Nucleic acid binder design. Structure first.
Lengths: 173, 142, 208, 38, 59
RNA sequence: GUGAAGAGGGAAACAACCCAGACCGCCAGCUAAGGUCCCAAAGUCAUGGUUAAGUGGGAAACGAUGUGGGAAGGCCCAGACAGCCGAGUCGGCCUGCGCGGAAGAU
RNA sequence: GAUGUCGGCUCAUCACAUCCUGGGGCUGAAGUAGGUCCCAAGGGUAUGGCUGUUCGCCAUUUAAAGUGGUACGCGAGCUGG
RNA sequence: GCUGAAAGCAUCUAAGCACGAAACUUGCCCCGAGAUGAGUUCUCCCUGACCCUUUAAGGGUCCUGAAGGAACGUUGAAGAC
């Protein structure tokens, strides 16, 4: 509603194509495609995109708001991109990168190897720090969560894999 | 005079073909059962079979409403103590798509020898092809 | 993979230099001859059919003779079938010998077990005997109770009772291959296998 | 998790949400406040 | 039995049994169900004429 | 009041509940209680609303931003609510239909 | 004008309000070991001394020695304390 | 748990996407086309004359007797028969 009534500006250098309910956005950082719900109409005025309901559906405004948010994110991604940062805390915990595989040592009796998906890049500016880059918000979030699940922060010392800006509470015995 | 009765040795039967893509299951099954029994002909006689032959195509594309595609359950028992078994609509469509329409039609027909005989005129397929071109079926729009 | 058809000869032992004794079953595996190849277009699945042995001429009927003559092979004592895996090829008239097992480590063997005829519950199902004294009345090896009262009022299906025992198809899995001798057509395996001396056996590479 | 028939907010950081047909209470300050109706 | 046969014959001409009976009553026809079924089976032009009569009465 | 000493139609089956009192025959017609998608006789009838739980087709004290209707209040273009500027937003009351509470033996 | 009633032996079959093994949330959860609630019925689940005992107490084991329905399962299958 | 509005924030859910157990469906072993919906593939055998009648999936005489099967005998690490 309030979110769906704000149009999205299409900055110079990006190509937009619409066909039925399928949308493609192309830019210097790559190409993204999506298929929208049957209760949204999207229009390409001159340099802006607008979203609105279709008559006959009872949840038009909510779906329109969701579509607006998703398209905004696509446009930002094909120009700037998204990045995430992960940190390791503990004694003997380490990480490294080779090709598109991350190697983790996290206190187990066996090593951990993670295979990155298509379109995501990784870097290690230190043995205790990981930086991920890409153009898809959902995929970058999922990859960060998958990496964090190998060893979650624990409440007595804070050891494990955490996000850079994450507040970890502690307590005493 | 006496009321008219139909004779099994001189009845006339015809061949039809139907497409099941996107149709609601029970509202198709009622029509199929009506025409297999023969309630659409003015010669209907309860103890004689006076129905037609029907081919059904595209049985894996039949539709249901609500949450039935994951919440309708088919049950049966094997005869051994403890042998009660079940499946869902999705699973049935995945392994034996024809049984879905066959079971529904069989439940709507008379129980007995004559109903078992009426069932034999139904031919159900899963794709878009059949091998009964020598019988020359005509298209039926339900 | 495919397997072979052989015959049970007997049992013996092998002595090792370290002082161990290994009990072995001896299996004679002659050459298997291919009689038919089945493909997807004509039959709907992929398999081969084989024969082995020899048979006397005046005991072969005309249908069987024609079947063997189409292939161009001598008559044998039976026909058997094996399913093919992706990337396996054979031709009609080919021979297969025991060198197929030169590098296999474990096998499965199938045969027909010995016959005991009509048997009781003590021998057939490991039921316990009742007392031999203390006033027992004609009920020493009898089965006992076979149900409940008015609910349910019948006997369930699958109940354990007396009947025929033995003389059926059995498989024993994961047996070591002790030796392959190609000049005498012998395969030596470790342990016991189903059947009696002189019966037919089917040998395949192990599935587990 | 507390499973019970009466579920309610116990402090100012508690929230009420409905997930897949179930009424739940989730809190950002206290893990002891996590509740499920059933 | 007579009623079932009449329903089958009328739906072939484009009307239901209940409407057909109402139309005959409003047109003042007094033929009974035995004779109606007989005509349905043995003479179809006459049955079509009767249906037209009932439709005109209802119109 | 009915069964006993009473048949016929309905309530799946079901003396005592609902409709209704069988002198005999007919391959005529109208209705009662109850019904009209198929088993199985007759509207896949017409017009305006509510439900998304297969509720309809088993059950309470109590709990909850499910959602339809009605009558009043407080703040707001002299800038309100939320977050970090530009149109609405807060909390009670009366009422319709749904959701959790809800574990058993072939 | 008859449906043989306690306990033992032999042979079982179902529920789930779960005794062991499997998966989880909270802890007044440092680790080892525990408390409480949710999901889960595939398989498994003692031998002796005393007494007619079912129970119960005691001795020594086990990952564990579950609770109930089936004419308080089962005498045209056995016993007869 | 990820992304995300209705509700300018927040939210695992309403639209979309990802994990998750000896329970479920398969994978292992045995029976199985009386599966009357009675299935598929390979091979083998039979190539003469007449009559009548109510004229049809009709009855009869002569010549011919295949592929194979059963019966009998000597029997089995197969068996109540």
């Amino acid at each position: 509603s309030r979110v769906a009534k704000a149009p999205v500006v299409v900055p110079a250098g990006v190509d937009v194509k619409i066909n039925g309910q399928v949308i493609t956005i192309k830019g210097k950082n790559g190409e993204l495609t999506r298929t929208l719900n049957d209760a949204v109409e999207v229009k390409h005025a001159d340099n802006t995109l607008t979203f609105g309901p279709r008559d006959g559906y009872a949840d038009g405004w909510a779906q329109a708001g969701t579509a607006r948010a998703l398209l905004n994110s696509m446009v930002i991604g094909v120009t700037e991109g998204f990045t995430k940062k992960l940190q390791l805390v503990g004694v003997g915990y380490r990480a490294a990168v080779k090709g598109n595989v991350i190697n983790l040592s996290l206190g187990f009796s066996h090593p951990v190897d993670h295979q990155l998906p298509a379109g995501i890049t990784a870097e290690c500016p230190t043995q205790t720090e990981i930086v991920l880059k890409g153009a898809d918000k959902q995929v970058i979030g999922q990859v960060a969560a998958d990496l964090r699940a190998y060893r979650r922060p624990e409440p007595y010392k804070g050891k494990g894999v955490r996000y850079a800006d994450e507040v970890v509470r502690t307590k005493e015995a | 005079m006496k009321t008219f009765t139909a004779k099994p040795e001189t009845v006339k039967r015809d061949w039809y073909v139907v497409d099941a893509t996107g149709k609601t299951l029970g509202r198709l099954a009622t029509e199929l059962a009506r025409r297999l029994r023969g309630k659409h002909k003015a010669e209907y006689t309860p103890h004689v079979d006076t129905g037609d032959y029907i081919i059904v195509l595209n049985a894996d594309k039949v539709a249901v409403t609500g949450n039935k595609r994951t919440d309708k359950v088919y049950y049966h028992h094997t005869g051994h103590i403890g042998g009660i078994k079940q499946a869902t609509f999705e699973e049935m469509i995945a392994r034996r798509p024809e049984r879905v329409i066959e079971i529904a039609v069989k439940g709507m027909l008379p129980k007995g020898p004559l109903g078992r005989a009426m069932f034999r005129k139904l031919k159900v397929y899963a794709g878009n092809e059949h091998n009964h071109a020598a019988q020359q079926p005509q298209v039926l729009d339900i | 993979m495919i397997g072979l058809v052989g015959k049970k000869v007997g049992m013996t032992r092998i002595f090792t230099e370290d002082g161990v004794s290994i009990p072995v079953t001896v299996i004679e595996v002659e050459a298997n001859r291919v009689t038919q190849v089945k493909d997807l277009a004509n039959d709907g699945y992929r398999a081969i059919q084989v024969t082995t042995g020899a048979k006397k001429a005046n005991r072969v009927t005309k249908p069987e003779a024609g079947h063997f003559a189409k292939a161009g092979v001598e008559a044998g004592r039976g026909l058997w079938e094996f399913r093919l895996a992706e990337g396996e090829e054979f031709t009609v008239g080919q021979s297969i010998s025991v060198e197929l097992f030169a590098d296999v480590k474990k096998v499965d063997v199938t045969g027909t077990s010995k016959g005991k005829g009509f048997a009781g519950t003590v021998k057939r199902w490991n039921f316990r005997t009742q007392d031999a004294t203390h006033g027992n009345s004609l009920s020493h090896r009898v089965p006992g109770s076979i149900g409940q009262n008015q609910t349910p009022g019948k006997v369930f299906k699958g109940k354990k009772m007396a009947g025929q025992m033995g003389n059926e198809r059995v498989t024993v899995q994961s047996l070591d291959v002790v030796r392959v001798d190609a000049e005498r057509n012998l395969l030596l395996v470790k342990g016991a296998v189903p059947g009696a001396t002189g019966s037919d056996l089917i040998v395949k590479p192990a599935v587990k | 998790m507390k499973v019970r028939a009466s579920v309610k907010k116990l402090c100012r950081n508690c929230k009420i949400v409905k997930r897949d047909g179930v009424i739940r209470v989730i809190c950002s300050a206290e893990p002891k406040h996590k509740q499920r109706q059933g | 039995l007579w009623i079932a046969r009449i329903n089958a014959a009328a739906r072939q001409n484009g009307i239901s049994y209940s409407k057909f009976i109402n139309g005959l009553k409003k047109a003042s026809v007094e033929i009974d169900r035995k004779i109606l079924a007989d005509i349905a089976v043995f003479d179809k032009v006459a049955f079509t004429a009767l249906v037209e009569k009932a439709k005109a009465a209802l119109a």
